[PDB]
Paper text:
The [name]‐[name]‐2 spike (S) protein is not only responsible for host cell entry but also the primary antigen for antibody generation in the human body elicited by vaccine or infection. Here, we report a potent and thermostable Nb, namely, Nb4, which can neutralize all of the Omicron subvariants at comparable levels. Based on our structural analysis, in vitro biochemical assays, virus titration and challenge assays, combined with relatively conserved binding epitopes on the S protein surfaces, we conclude that Nb4 and its multivalent forms are broad‐spectrum Nbs for neutralizing [name]‐[name]‐2 VOCs, in particular Omicron strains.
To understand the neutralization mechanism of Nb4 to Omicron viruses, we used single‐particle Cryo‐EM method to solve the 3D structure of Nb4‐16t in complex with the BA. S protein in complex with Nb4‐16t, a “2‐RBD up/1‐RBD down” conformation of the Spike protein was dominant. Corresponding particles could be further classified into two classes. S protein in complex with Nb4‐30t, we also observed a “2‐RBD up/1‐RBD down” conformation of S protein with two copies of Nb4s at 3.6 Å resolution, with one copy of Nb4 on the “down” RBD and the other Nb4 on one of the “up” RBDs. In all three Cryo‐EM structures, the Nb4‐S protein interfaces have significantly lower local resolutions, which do not clearly show densities for Nb sidechains but allow us to build Nbs with confidence due to our high‐resolution RBD–Nb4 crystal structure (see above). Nb4 can bind RBDs in both up and down positions using the same RBD–Nb4 interface. The Nb4 unit binding to the RBD in down position appears to be more stable than those in up positions, likely because of additional van der Waals contacts formed between the Nb4 in down position and one of the two other RBDs in up positions (detailed contacts remain unclear due to low local resolution). Interestingly, the Nb4 in down position would collide with the RBD–RBD packing interactions in the “all‐down” conformation of trimeric S protein (RBD1 numbering 371−376). 4 Thus, binding of a Nb4 with one RBD unit in down position would block the RBD–RBD packing in the “all‐down” conformation and thus keep two other RBDs in up positions and expose more epitopes. We suggest that via binding of Nb4 to one of the RBDs in S protein trimer, other RBD‐binding antibodies or Nbs, such as another Nb4 unit in a multivalent Nb4, can then bind to the exposed RBDs to enhance the neutralization capacity.
Author numbering:
A (entry chain B): 29 to 67, 71 to 298
B (entry chain B): 745 to 828, 849 to 1041
C (entry chain I): 1 to 124
D (entry chain C): 299 to 527, 530 to 677, 689 to 744
E (entry chain C): 943 to 1041
F (entry chain A): 943 to 991
Write the structure that this text describes.
C-alpha cells in the first residue's frame, strides 16, 4: 500500500511550538510500499498464516483489529531459546512486555473455532510459555490497547506502532486514532508520540504477531505480498535514514511534516 | 555571562570593539539617510481647509484627518502591504535600535512636502513658499515640457478627470500586485534573515564538545576546557564578523539607494525634471 | 588524577654493593603509567634512571646506570623493585620514585607525579 | 564615557559606553526529583566478573550515592576518562550511562581505547572513536586468578569480522579459517574462535587477569541517573539554575505552554532552552534570560557641563534599572537608581533627564522621536519630543498669486571628500617579525 | 564642525591603522604576542602550532582591515564621482536640477 | 587600451577564480594539501585536527 503521511513520530523529547525543525533520523518515506502481510487459520493444521518478517531497521505497524483480534508481537532473531526475544503482549488490563530467550515461538494454540459465542476470558492462549535463560524484566503499565467504546463507528483504532531498535532502546511510537476510516490509511497527518521506549541491548532480525484470543475472530486473508495494497490485517513499514523536516503546531504538536528526500519540490 | 570565557576573549584584543563601532556607524548612517531623504523642508506647510484645487482631487494622497494616525490612504495601504522569533533576537545581545524618526513624524514630513507642492508649486523648494493657484501651476508645468498654456486651460476638466482616474488606479495597482513593494520587503527580509542566521550560528559546535559553553565549563576542568572554549570562540567571532561585513556592504548599498532617492525627491518633487525617464 | 606511591628500601651500601628497592602503587590514575626511579646526583639535576611498564613488556637503562641497574615489578603485591648488580661508589644520592602518567615515554622530562626519596650513601 | 572615548573631554552627543546586566541573586539546584539517584556502584569491587567479550550491563538509576565511594574501592585502578574531567564526575548528572564489566589480561588493557588493534581490540571489544566516558580497570590477581588455573574466563582470537562499538557475539560456532570447507567440524583451515585464559596468581602482570569496567555516559537531555549532591524553587527572580544538570542563569516563571507527558524540555527557533519542566513538581517553567540592555550616556559635552543622563536601551525601567541593588548591575553607580527623574521612552528609558513638552529641534538624538538638550527649564538636561519645524500655513486661494519683488544672492558651501590616504602593507614585515 | 566629512575620513583611516598596529600586540591564543620570544623560548617541534595560531590571528586582522578599507574606498569613490558630477555641471556649466 | 574597463572586469573575475582554485595547494599548516594523503598517512582519530 502507499503510506501517504504515516510513519512520522516525535524524534526527541524536547518541546517546540511553531518551529520548522529539520532533523535526520530513520523514518518511513511518504508514499512508500507497505506489505498488508495478511494473516489467522487455526481451524485445522495451522494454515501457515501470520507470516514472518525480516525486520530491516525497525518496522512500521498499523492494524484495525476489532478489539483484541490483534494481540501482540514477538521479536528476536531465531524465534527459539537461542537468541533473545521481546514477548511484547497485550492483555485486557495491562501489557506484559518481557524479553531474554524462550524455548521457542509457540504459535497461537489450537483453540475453538467459533469466536464470538461465549468466551471473553484470557486462558490457554498462545502460551509460548516456553522460556530458557533470561535477563531483563517486564514493564507492566497501562496497556496500549485502550478500547474506547466505538460510538457509532468514528473510532478506527489505527495502532501505528513503530519498533525502531537502535542503541538498545525499543522505542514504540504509537497513536490510537479516535477517527474512523473510509479507507485504510486515511489522508491527513498523524504524528506518533512515543508510548514506551524500552531499553535493552539485542539485535533483532524477525518479527511476528499474535491473534491468540482462544477464538480466531473473523480474520480474512490472501497469500501474497510485494507491496500488497487493499485491505488486510496489518503493515510492515521499513524505515530508512531520511532528513524529514517537521512543522510543530502552536500547541507544540507535529501538525504536518515534509520529506527532504521525496520530490524535487520537497527538496 | 561566562567570566572565564570573557577573560579568554580578551586575548584577541580590540577585535570586537571595532565591530560595535562599525555597527554604530551603520545605525547613525541610517538615521542620516532618512534625514537626507525626508528632511528637505525647513517648515511644515498645511493644506488649506478647503481642498478644491481647480477640479483636481488629492484626498487619496493628502493625510486623512479621521484616522488616529495622520497617514494618507496610499500610506495606509503601504503600511498594511509591508509585513515584518522577533523577540528571541533580543535574548542574545542582538538588540535592534528603533529609528530616530518615528513613522508618524515621517508621515508629517511627507504631508508637509505634499502641501508645499500643492500650494506653492516648486517655488518653496528654492526659497519662500510663494502661493499659486493650482490650475496655473499645472499650466506652467505644462509649459516646461513643451506644450503651451492654452492646451491645459481648454482641457482643464479633462486633465483633472484623467488625473483623478490615474490616482484612483494607483491604489488598485498597489493592492492587486503582491510584488509591488518588492524592494522594501526584500530589505526587511534580508536583514531579518541575516540576524536569524547569525543567532542560528550558535548551534554549530565548531569542532568543540558542545555548543553551550556553560556545559563545557561544567564538564571539563578549566585547565583543559579552554581549548574547546577557544575553538568555539574562533568560530563565534568569525561568524559575528561575517555578519558585520555583510551588514556593512548592504548598508553601503542602502546608502547609495537613499542618496538616489533623496536626489530624485529634490528634483522630481521640489521641481520639474527635464531628465528623461 | 591523584596517585599515592609507597617507596621503601635503602640502607648503607658499599662500593661494589647492591640495592633491592621497592615502590608500591595505589590510587586512581588517568592512565596506567610506568613506575621507576627519577634520581639526581647529589647537587645535580634530577635524571632518569630506569623504566618498567605496567604490562612487564618495556625496560629502559641509561649509560650512567648500565651494568649496575635493573628494574622489576612484583606480580603479587605490585611493588616495583630496583634489583642491582655491583653498584659503584659514586651513587651517594637520593633516589626519587617518580611516576609518569603516560602509556608511552616519548620524553622523560615531564613527570606527572613525584614520590619519596631514598638517600643511600656508598662507603665502607 | 570619557574612558571609552580615550579622551579627557567629550562633545555634545550620546555615546554608547558599555552593557547593563542584572546579576543573578541566588542559586537553584534541583538535581533529582521527589527522591534521589545512584549507580548502585558496588559491582566495582567484586571477584566473579565475566570474560573479555562478556562486558556487563547496568541501567542504573535512583537509590544510593552516585559517587564519593569508588576512590577507595580498590588500591589501584584505571581512571581513563574521555570527555568529562576526572575531578567533575560527582557534579555531572549523566543520564544514559552504560556499565560494562569483563576480564582481560594486563597486556590487552591498552587495547581498551578508541582506535586500538589486537586480539580483543580488533575483534572482541571495539571502542567508538567519539567515545565519552571513563574506564575502570584494576589488577584482580588476588580475586580472579586461580592457583590451579582460572580457565573460566575466556577470550576470542580467531574471529573473522570486527565488532562495532558496544557490539557483541555470544555465538561459539566453529570459525572457518581457510579455503577448505569444514561443515561445522574443527580441523584443517578451522580454529575455535574461543580460547581459554591462563589465569594463575604466579604469572606475569601483562598476562595477569584484570577486571575491566567501562562507564559510557551520554551528556545530553532526558532525565539523568547519577549526581552526588539540593532544592528550593524561585519563581520570579533572575537566579542561577542547575535543573538536573542544565547549568545556566535565567528568570524562572510560569509557562502557559503545555507539555506532552513525555516532553521533558522545551525550546524555540533558537539554541536556548526556553522552557524546562522541573525535575520534581512536574511544573512547566518559562526560563528566560534576565533583563539586560546596552547603556548609553547623553552628555552636552564636558566643556559645557559635566552633568549627564544615561539611557538604558531596550529596557522597561518601571522596575529593572531603577530598583538596582548594591552593585547588582555592571554600570554600578547605585546613586543613579532614581537620580533626578526617570522617563520611559520607546528606545529603552531615560535616567536623569526631565521630560518637557515644549518641542524643539533635535539636539542630541535618542530614538523614537526623542532628543535631549542642555538649557533652562538653572540649566539641566531635558528630553523634549522632536519638533519637525515651524508650522507655516500657506494662504492658497483660487485667484491669489505671490510674486517676489526682490532677491538675495546667497552663497552656500559644500564639502565633499575625494580621496583617502594611499596606505600600503607588507606581509613578511607585518605578519611575521 | 563645518569641515566634518574630511576630518571623519582622515580620522577613520588613521584610527583604523592604529587599531591594526595594536592588533599585532594581541595574544591571539599564543603564549606571548612576541614572536621571537616564543620561537627562542620553546622547542621548534611544538612552536609551529603557536606560530600558526599567531599568524592566523594576525592575517585575519589584516584581512579585516583590508576589507574595511575596500568598503570605505567604495564609499569614497561614490563621493568622488558625485563631486566630479557636481564640478562638471555646477562649475563648468549651470544646472537646472533643483537643490 | 581604450577598452580598459571591460578587460579589467573580465581579467579581475578570471584571476579571482584562478586564485581561489590555486588555494587548494595551500597546506594551511597541514601535512599535505590533498585530503586523501592526510586520510591515509594518519589514523582517523588523529587526522581530524
Ligand atoms: C476624491 O476621491 C475620493 C476617492 O474616491 C473620493 O472619496 C469617495 O467619494 C465617494 C463619493 O463621491 C464615496 O462614495 C466614497 O466612499 C469615497 N471614498 C473614499 C475613500 O473617501 C472623494 O469624494 C473625491 N473628492 C471629491 C471632492 O469628490
Ligand atoms: C564495593 O564498591 C564500593 C565502591 O565501588 C565500595 O566503596 C569503597 O570500597 C572500599 C573497598 O572496596 C572501602 O575501603 C571504602 O570504604 C568504600 N567506600 C565507601 C565510603 O563506601 C564498597 O565498600 C564495596 N562493597 C560493597 C558494599 O559492595
Ligand atoms: C532689495 O533688497 C536689498 C537688500 O537685499 C535692498 O538693499 C538695501 O536697502 C536698504 C533700504 O533701507 C538699505 O538700508 C540697505 O543698505 C540696502 N542693502 C544693500 C546691500 O544694498 C533693496 O533696497 C531692496 N529693494 C527693494 C525694491 O525691495
Ligand atoms: C511500491 O511498489 C509497488 C509495486 O510492487 C506499488 O504497488 C506501490 O504503489 C509502491 N508504493 C510506492 C508509491 O512507493
Ligand atoms: C490548542 O489547544 C486548545 C485547547 O488547549 C484548543 O482550544 C486550540 O484550538 C488548539 N489550537 C491548535 C491550533 O492546536
Ligand atoms: C546479531 O546477530 C546477527 C546475526 O543474526 C549478527 O550478524 C550480529 O553481529 C549480531 N549482533 C550482536 C549485537 O550480537
Ligand atoms: C563647550 O561648550 C560651551 C558651552 O557652555 C562653549 O561655550 C565652549 O566654547 C565649548 N568648548 C569647546 C570648544 O568645545
Ligand atoms: C515593562 O513593564 C511595564 C510594567 O512593569 C510595562 O508597562 C511595559 O509595557 C513593559 N515594557 C516592555 C518593553 O515589556
Ligand atoms: C506638557 O504639555 C501640557 C502643558 O503644557 C500638558 O497637557 C502635558 O501633560 C505636559 N506634559 C508633557 C507632555 O511634557
Ligand atoms: C476657488 O477657491 C475659492 C477660495 O479661494 C473657493 O471658495 C471657490 O469655491 C473656488 N472657486 C472655483 C469653483 O473655482
Amino acid at each position: 500500500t502507499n503510506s501517504f503521511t504515516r510513519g512520522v513520530y516525535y524524534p526527541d523529547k524536547v518541546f517546540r511550538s511553531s518551529v520548522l525543525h529539520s532533523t535526520q533520523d530513520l523514518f518511513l518515506p511518504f508514499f512508500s510500499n507497505v506489505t498488508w502481510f495478511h494473516a489467522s487459520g487455526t481451524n485445522g493444521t495451522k494454515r501457515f498464516d501470520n507470516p514472518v518478517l525480516p525486520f530491516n531497521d525497525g518496522v512500521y505497524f498499523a492494524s484495525t483489529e476489532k478489539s483484541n483480534i490483534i494481540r501482540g508481537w514477538i521479536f528476536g532473531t531465531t524465534l527459539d531459546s537461542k537468541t533473545q526475544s521481546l514477548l511484547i503482549v497485550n492483555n485486557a488490563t495491562n501489557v506484559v512486555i518481557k524479553v531474554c530467550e524462550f524455548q521457542f515461538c509457540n504459535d497461537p494454540f489450537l483453540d475453538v473455532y467459533y469466536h464470538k459465542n461465549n468466551k471473553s476470558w484470557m486462558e490457554s492462549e498462545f502460551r509460548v510459555y516456553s522460556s530458557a535463560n533470561n535477563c531483563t524484566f517486564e514493564y507492566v503499565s497501562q496497556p496500549f490497547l485502550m478500547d474506547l467504546e466505538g460510538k457509532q463507528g468514528n473510532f478506527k483504532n489505527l495502532r501505528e506502532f513503530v519498533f525502531k531498535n537502535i542503541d538498545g532502546y525499543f522505542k514504540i511510537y504509537s497513536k490510537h486514532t479516535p477517527i474512523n476510516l473510509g479507507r485504510d490509511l486515511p489522508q491527513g497527518f498523524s504524528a506518533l508520540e512515543p508510548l514506551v521506549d524500552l531499553p535493552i541491548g539485542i539485535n533483532i532480525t524477525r518479527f511476528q504477531t499474535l491473534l491468540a484470543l482462544h477464538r480466531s475472530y473473523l480474520t480474512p486473508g490472501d497469500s501474497s505480498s510485494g507491496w500488497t495494497a487493499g485491505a488486510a490485517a496489518y503493515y510492515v513499514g521499513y524505515l530508512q535514514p531520511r532528513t524529514f523536516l517537521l512543522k510543530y503546531n502552536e500547541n507544540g504538536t507535529i501538525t504536518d511534516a515534509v520529506d527532504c528526500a521525496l520530490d524535487p519540490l520537497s527538496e | 555571562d561566562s567570566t572565564e570565557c570573557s577573560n579568554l576573549l580578551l586575548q584577541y584584543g580590540s577585535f570586537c570593539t571595532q565591530l560595535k563601532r562599525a555597527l554604530t556607524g551603520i545605525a547613525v548612517e541610517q538615521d542620516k539617510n532618512t534625514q537626507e531623504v525626508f528632511a528637505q523642508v525647513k517648515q511644515i506647510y498645511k493644506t488649506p481647509p478647503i481642498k478644491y484645487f481647480g477640479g483636481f482631487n488629492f484626498s487619496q494622497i493628502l493625510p486623512d484627518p479621521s484616522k488616529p494616525s495622520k497617514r494618507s490612504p496610499i500610506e495606509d495601504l503601504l503600511f498594511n502591504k509591508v509585513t515584518l522569533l522577533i523577540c528571541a533576537q533580543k535574548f542574545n545581545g542582538l538588540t535592534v535600535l528603533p529609528p530616530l524618526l518615528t513613522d508618524e513624524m515621517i508621515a508629517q514630513y511627507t504631508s508637509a512636502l505634499l502641501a508645499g507642492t500643492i500650494t506653492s508649486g516648486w517655488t518653496f523648494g528654492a526659497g519662500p513658499a510663494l502661493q499659486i493657484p493650482f490650475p496655473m501651476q499645472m499650466a506652467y508645468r505644462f509649459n516646461g515640457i513643451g506644450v503651451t498654456q492654452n492646451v491645459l486651460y481648454e482641457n482643464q476638466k479633462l486633465i483633472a478627470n484623467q488625473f483623478n482616474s490615474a490616482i484612483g488606479k494607483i491604489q488598485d495597482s498597489l493592492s492587486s500586485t503582491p510584488s509591488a513593494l518588492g524592494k522594501l520587503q526584500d530589505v526587511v527580509n534580508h536583514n531579518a534573515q541575516a540576524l536569524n542566521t547569525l543567532v542560528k550560528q550558535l548551534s554549530s559546535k565548531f569542532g568543540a564538545i558542545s555548543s553551550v559553553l556553560n556545559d563545557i565549563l561544567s564538564r571539563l576542568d578549566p585547565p583543559e576546557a579552554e581549548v574547546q572554549i577557544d575553538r568555539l570562540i574562533t568560530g563565534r567571532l568569525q561568524s559575528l564578523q561575517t555578519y558585520v561585513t555583510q551588514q556593512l556592504i548592504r548598508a553601503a548599498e542602502i546608502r547609495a539607494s537613499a542618496n538616489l532617492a533623496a536626489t530624485k525627491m529634490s528634483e522630481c518633487v521640489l521641481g520639474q525634471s527635464k531628465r528623461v525617464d | 588524577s591523584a596517585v599515592q606511591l609507597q617507596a621503601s628500601g635503602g640502607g648503607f651500601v658499599q662500593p661494589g654493593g647492591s640495592l633491592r628497592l621497592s615502590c608500591a602503587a595505589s590510587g586512581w590514575a588517568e592512565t596506567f603509567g610506568h613506575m621507576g626511579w627519577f634520581r639526581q646526583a647529589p647537587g645535580k639535576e634530577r635524571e632518569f634512571v630506569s623504566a618498567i611498564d605496567w604490562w612487564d613488556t618495556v625496560h629502559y637503562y641509561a649509560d650512567s646506570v648500565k651494568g649496575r641497574f635493573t628494574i622489576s615489578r612484583d606480580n603479587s603485591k605490585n611493588t616495583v623493585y630496583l634489583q642491582m648488580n655491583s653498584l659503584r661508589a659514586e651513587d651517594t644520592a637520593t633516589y626519587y620514585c617518580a611516576y609518569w602518567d603516560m602509556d608511552y615515554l616519548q620524553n622523560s622530562i615531564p613527570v606527572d607525579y613525584w614520590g619519596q626519596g631514598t638517600q643511600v650513601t656508598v662507603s665502607s | 564615557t570619557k574612558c571609552t572615548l580615550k579622551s579627557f573631554t567629550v562633545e555634545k552627543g550620546i555615546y554608547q559606553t558599555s552593557n547593563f546586566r542584572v546579576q543573578p541573586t541566588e542559586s537553584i539546584v534541583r538535581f533529582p526529583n521527589i527522591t534521589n539517584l545512584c549507580p548502585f556502584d558496588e559491582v566495582f569491587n567484586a571477584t566473579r566478573f565475566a570474560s573479555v567479550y562478556a562486558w556487563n550491563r547496568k541501567r542504573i538509576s535512583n537509590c544510593v550515592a552516585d559517587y564519593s565511594v569508588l576512590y577507595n574501592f580498590a588500591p589501584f585502578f584505571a581512571f581513563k576518562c574521555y570527555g568529562v574531567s576526572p575531578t567533575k564526575l560527582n557534579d555531572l548528572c549523566f543520564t544514559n550511562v552504560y556499565a560494562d564489566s569483563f576480564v582481560i589480561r594486563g597486556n590487552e588493557v591498552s587495547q581498551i581505547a578508541p582506535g586500538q588493534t589486537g586480539n580483543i581490540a580488533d575483534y572482541n571489544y571495539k571502542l567508538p572513536d567519539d567515545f565519552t566516558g571513563c574506564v575502570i580497570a584494576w589488577n584482580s590477581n588476588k580475586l580472579d586468578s586461580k592457583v590451579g588455573g582460572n580457565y573460566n574466563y575466556r577470550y576470542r582470537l580467531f574471529r573473522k569480522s570486527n565488532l562495532k562499538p558496544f557490539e557483541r557475539d555470544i555465538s561459539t560456532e566453529i570459525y572457518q579459517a581457510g579455503n577448505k570447507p569444514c561443515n561445522g567440524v574443527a580441523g584443517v583451515n578451522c580454529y575455535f574462535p574461543l580460547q581459554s585464559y591462563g589465569f594463575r596468581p604466579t604469572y606475569g602482570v601483562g598476562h595477569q587477569p584484570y577486571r575491566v569496567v567501562v562507564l559510557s555516559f551520554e551528556l545530553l537531555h532526558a532525565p539523568a541517573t547519577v549526581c552526588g549532591p539540593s532544592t528550593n524553587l524561585v519563581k520570579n527572580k533572575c537566579v542561577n539554575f542547575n535543573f538536573n544538570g542544565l547549568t545556566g542563569t535565567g528568570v524562572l516563571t510560569e509557562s502557559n505552554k503545555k507539555f506532552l507527558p513525555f516532553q521533558q524540555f522545551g525550546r524555540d527557533i533558537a539554541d536556548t532552552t526556553d522552557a524546562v519542566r522541573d525535575p520534581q513538581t512536574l511544573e512547566i517553567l518559562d526560563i528566560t534570560p534576565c533583563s539586560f540592555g546596552g547603556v548609553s550616556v547623553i552628555t552636552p559635552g564636558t566643556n559645557t557641563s559635566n552633568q549627564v543622563a544615561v539611557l538604558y536601551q531596550g529596557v522597561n525601567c518601571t522596575e529593572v534599572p531603577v530598583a538596582i541593588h548594591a552593585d547588582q548591575l555592571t554600570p554600578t553607580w547605585r546613586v543613579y537608581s532614581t537620580g533626578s527623574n526617570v522617563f520611559q521612552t520607546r528606545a529603552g528609558c531615560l535616567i536623569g533627564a526631565e521630560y518637557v513638552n515644549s518641542s524643539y529641534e533635535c539636539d542630541i538624538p535618542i530614538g523614537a522621536g526623542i532628543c535631549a538638550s542642555y538649557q533652562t527649564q538653572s540649566q539641566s538636561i531635558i528630553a523634549y519630543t522632536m519638533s519637525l519645524g515651524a508650522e507655516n500655513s500657506v494662504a492658497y486661494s483660487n485667484n491669489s498669486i505671490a510674486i517676489p519683488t526682490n532677491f538675495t544672492i546667497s552663497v552656500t558651501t559644500e564639502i565633499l571628500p575625494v580621496s583617502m590616504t594611499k596606505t600600503s602593507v607588507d606581509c613578511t614585515m607585518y605578519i611575521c617579525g
